């Protein structure tokens, strides 16, 4: 059972170190927060059953494709646990929602992330469900022509899907609606591809126009986006769906 291991290796909370109250300072602060969070994501994935055994090249590819889904999913969990999904709990010292956003695009991205959090309230998502779904998001995007150890990846992915299904369908808390719930969780994972697509498009823009927009990125994100952007731009990114 990886569930026991998953609870143990779960990263601890990181602070933003918030302040001038401008769009470029908010974005720069969020990006520097992402860099701190990325260190804890990599240490989490390093000791993850199955993933820990894939070639180094495949581990890098997977993290570079899914870093955004992992961070937005963890943000939705914190938002749910600490504010009942009224606000986006980026860090204990940086908590806000759409109402603080004046630019149309920024409001919609903020709202999209809030809508995932509200779906956690509707589902009353548990920590066990969350940790398995988080792993499934790390395994949600692959290169168009596959990975180095494609079969080993397919085995590990199918195993994590089965762990989610057995956990949901065997729980007495879901009696009479366990399959309906499993399909709601898999639909929520598919809908993560849509949200993440939008968060990545704005991220790629603020990255390319970083100097002009005065939007700062930490070294971790500079290196990740530098490798990810040419892969996404060239169509070398295959999102894996449950219902599509």
């Amino acid at each position: 059972s990886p569930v026991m291991v998953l609870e143990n290796i779960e990263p601890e909370i990181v602070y933003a170190g918030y302040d001038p109250d401008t769009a470029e300072n908010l974005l720069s602060t969020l990006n520097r927060l992402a860099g701190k969070q990325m260190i804890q994501v990599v240490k989490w994935a390093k000791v993850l059953p199955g993933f820990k055994n894939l070639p180094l090249e495949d581990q890098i590819t997977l993290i570079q494709y899914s870093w955004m889904s992992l961070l937005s999913f963890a943000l939705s969990w914190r938002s749910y646990k600490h504010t009942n999904s009224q606000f986006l709990y980026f860090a204990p010292d940086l908590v806000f929602n759409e109402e603080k956003m004046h630019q149309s695009a920024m409001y919609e991205l903020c709202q999209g992330m809030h809508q995932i959090s509200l779906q956690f309230v509707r589902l009353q998502l548990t920590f066990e469900e969350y940790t398995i779904m988080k792993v499934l998001l790390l395994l949600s995007t692959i290169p168009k022509d596959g990975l180095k150890s494609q079969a080993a990846f397919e085995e590990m992915r199918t195993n994590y899907i089965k762990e989610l299904r057995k956990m949901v369908t065997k729980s007495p808390n879901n009696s009479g609606q366990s399959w309906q719930r499993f399909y709601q969780l898999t639909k929520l994972l598919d809908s993560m591809h849509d949200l993440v697509s939008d968060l990545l498009e704005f991220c790629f823009y603020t990255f390319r126009e970083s100097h002009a927009l005065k939007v700062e990125f930490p070294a971790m994100l500079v290196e990740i986006i530098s490798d990810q952007l040419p892969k996404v731009e060239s169509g070398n990114a295959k999102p894996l769906y449950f219902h599509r």
Binding site: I39, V42, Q64, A219
Partner: peptide, 12 residues
């Protein structure tokens, strides 16, 4: 040009 932060963290 050099080992990435992602690669160093995965191999440390």
């Amino acid at each position: 040009q050099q080992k990435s932060l992602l690669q160093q963290l995965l191999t440390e």
